[PDB]
Amino acid sequence: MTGREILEKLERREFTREVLKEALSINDRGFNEALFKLADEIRRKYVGDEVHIRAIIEFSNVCRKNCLYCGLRRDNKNLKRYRMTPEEIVERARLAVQFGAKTIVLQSGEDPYYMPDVISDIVKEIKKMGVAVTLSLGEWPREYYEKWKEAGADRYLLRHETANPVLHRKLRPDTSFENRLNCLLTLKELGYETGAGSMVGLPGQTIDDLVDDLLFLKEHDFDMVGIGPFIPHPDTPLANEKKGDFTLTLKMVALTRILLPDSNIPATTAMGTIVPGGREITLRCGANVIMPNWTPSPYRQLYQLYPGKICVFEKDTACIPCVMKMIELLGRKPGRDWGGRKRVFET
Ligand SMILES: C[C@H](CCC(=O)NCCC[N+](C)(C)CCCS(=O)(=O)[O-])[C@H]1CC[C@H]2[C@@H]3[C@H](O)C[C@@H]4C[C@H](O)CC[C@]4(C)[C@H]3C[C@H](O)[C@]12C
Ligand SMILES: C[C@H](CCC(=O)NCCC[N+](C)(C)CCCS(=O)(=O)[O-])[C@H]1CC[C@H]2[C@@H]3[C@H](O)C[C@@H]4C[C@H](O)CC[C@]4(C)[C@H]3C[C@H](O)[C@]12C
Ligand SMILES: Nc1ncnc2c1ncn2[C@@H]1O[C@H](CSCC[C@H](N)C(=O)O)[C@@H](O)[C@H]1O
Ligand code: SF4
Ligand code: FES
Ligand SMILES: [C-]#N
Ligand SMILES: [Fe+2]
Ligand SMILES: [S]
Ligand SMILES: [S]
């Protein structure tokens, strides 16, 4: 179809596989800009001008899994491993709340040391501060997810990475897409606000795979969707592969907003790493959430999912003020509440 015809169908919410594939296959600048403008408008209409700040504390880089893309994979001996103590984590979260953070995100490698009871105790302490808590700890038994929900966790970010089961198993040899999806369904059933999302430009991933990622996100109606480019890490088996394309990833963000108009969608760290100013662009093409790095030195530099990760060289209180300045210069507004999903029921 022509680009104009594709945009017309997107505006009429006729989200067929062919429409999504054509949107991802057209590279015309005029089409792309019109797609970004549509997503920006849908974002404004459904979720408004507030940009929600989620302060991330990457509290351990120990991991039991061996994902082929990830710098924290267990086979990487070229990385100093660290673990923050529970007291350090709680006090670091307290500092973020003192700086105005309304959500605390705890993210780590799949580090067994904390699971499940240390996490539960940390969550209970942070919840006393009157903020939302999001966990991003990987794949664990239902019993652990249950304990963390009873302890007060509000949300769970478990990006699905890729909806292609063959590619998923090759890149994540300890597990499977089937288990990842089961974890996501369990999280939803337990009442978490649940986040999924994929990487764009993985080795062997096709445009059809990206369409499947979009249809997967639409099918399950996730509360949050985290999308970013694949960034090769020199100490992994994918060191020599090509990085994901920023524009194609941006189109995935924009189409996700169009498909899931009331969802929460971050402008990911990876988007800011791949292109200078990438997060600001993404906030203008469908995203409405930003997640400043709140990991303290000397650990911030060691959470090396991929190289070149932004904000490693800044003072460790720098990122919350920085994103507040970013939101203001974008003409946007601070989030006033926890920024939970506000469902607009449609037809
Ligand atoms: C800032 C630059 C180009 C600068 C420019 O060229 N214009 C700025 C003011 C100049 N004026 C036209 C007002 C004066 C003309 C008189 S003059 O004689 O000086 O030319 C423009 C050109 C293309 C624009 C992006 C695309 O749309 C896609 C997307 C749409 C979303 O919704 C918002 C985000 C995003 C990324 C846009 C952001 C921004 O907006 C861009 C980069
Ligand atoms: C942590 C220390 C010491 C005092 C303290 O421990 N303060 C707790 C505040 C708790 N809250 C944020 C929930 C209050 C919000 C009240 S508010 O009126 O904003 O709704 C206080 C003293 C001055 C405060 C900064 C400045 O102000 C400027 C700026 C305002 C933004 O906005 C938030 C970010 C920033 C950088 C502030 C961060 C932080 O806060 C500072 C460093
Ligand atoms: N090389 C790379 N490039 C871009 N993103 C990467 C990456 N390696 C890992 N990531 C992203 O980092 C995210 C958090 S990894 C930490 C949380 C948890 N261990 C988990 O796997 O869910 C992953 O979901 C993945 O999408
Ligand atoms: S993506 Fe998550 S589970 Fe996989 S190696 Fe990295 S930290 Fe471990
Ligand atoms: S958000 Fe980290 S220094 Fe700007
Ligand atoms: C992630 N931001
Ligand atoms: Fe993230
Ligand atoms: S930062
Ligand atoms: S920033």
Ligand 5: atom nearest CA of 311 is: 2
> For residue 325, how many other CB atoms are within 10 A of its CB?
10
Q: Closest Cα to residue 159, out of 132, 139, 174?
A: 139
Query: How far is it between the farthest Cα atoms of the chain?
Result: 58
What residue owns the CA closest to ligand 2's atom 12?
100
The approach used to solve this structure was X-ray
How remote is the CA of residue 190 from the centroid of ligand 7, in Å? Answer: 22
Using alpha carbons, list the distances in angstroms from residue 5 to 8, 12, 63, 208. 5, 11, 47, 20
Please report the sign of the dihedral spanned by the C-alpha atoms of residue 220, residue 16, residue 244, residue 328.
Answer: negative
Contact 86, 115 (CB under 8 A): no
100 lines ligand 2 (CB under 6 A): yes
Q: Which residues contact 116 (CB under 8 A, 6 or more apart)?
A: 140, 143, 144, 147, 148
Q: In the structure encoding, which two tokens stand for residue 266, read together?
A: 């971050």
SS (H, E, C) the chain: CCHHHHHHHHHCCCCCHHHHHHHHHCCCHHHHHHHHHHHHHHHHHHHCCEEEEEEEEEEECCCCCCCCCCCCCCCCCCCCCCECCHHHHHHHHHHHHHCCCCEEEEEECCCHHHCCHHHHHHHHHHHCCCCEEEEECCCCCHHHHHHHHHCCCCEEECCCECCCHHHHHHHCCCCCHHHHHHHHHHHHHCCCEEEECEEECCCCCCHHHHHHHHHHHHHHCCCEECCEECCCCCCCCCCCCCCCCHHHHHHHHHHHHHHCCCCECECCHHHHHHCCCHHHHHHCCCCCEECCECCCCCCHHHCCCCCCCCCCCCCCCCHHHHHHHHHHHCCCEECCCCCCCCCCCCC
Q: Closest Cα to residue 221, out of 108, 346, 314, 78?
A: 346
Q: What is the rounded CA–CA span in Å between residue 331 and residue 239?
A: 39
Tokens 């797609």, residue? 35
> For residue 5, how many other CB atoms are within 10 A of its CB?
11
Please report the sign of the dihedral spanned by the C-alpha atoms of residue 334, residue 152, residue 318, residue 72.
Answer: negative
Ligand 1: atom nearest CA of 41 is: 32
How remote is the CA of residue 329 from the centroid of ligand 8, in Å? Answer: 16
State which amino acid sits at residue 179. Answer: N
Which residue(s) pair with 132 in the sheet? 103
How remote is the CA of residue 321 from the centroid of ligand 2, in Å? Answer: 10
How remote is the CA of residue 269 from the centroid of ligand 4, in Å? Answer: 16
Q: What is the rounded CA–CA span in Å between residue 319 and residue 321?
A: 6
What residue owns the CA closest to ligand 1's atom 28?
33
Distance of CA 5 to the CA centre of its chain: 31
What residue owns the CA closest to ligand 8's atom 1?
319
Tokens 């607009």, residue? 344
Q: Closest Cα to residue 91, out of 136, 52, 128, 126?
A: 126
98 lines ligand 2 (CB under 6 A): yes
Instruction: Measure the CA dihedral 154/213/251/3, to 10°.
Output: -140
Q: What is the set of domains in the chain, with CATH numbers?
A: 2-347 (3.20.20.70)
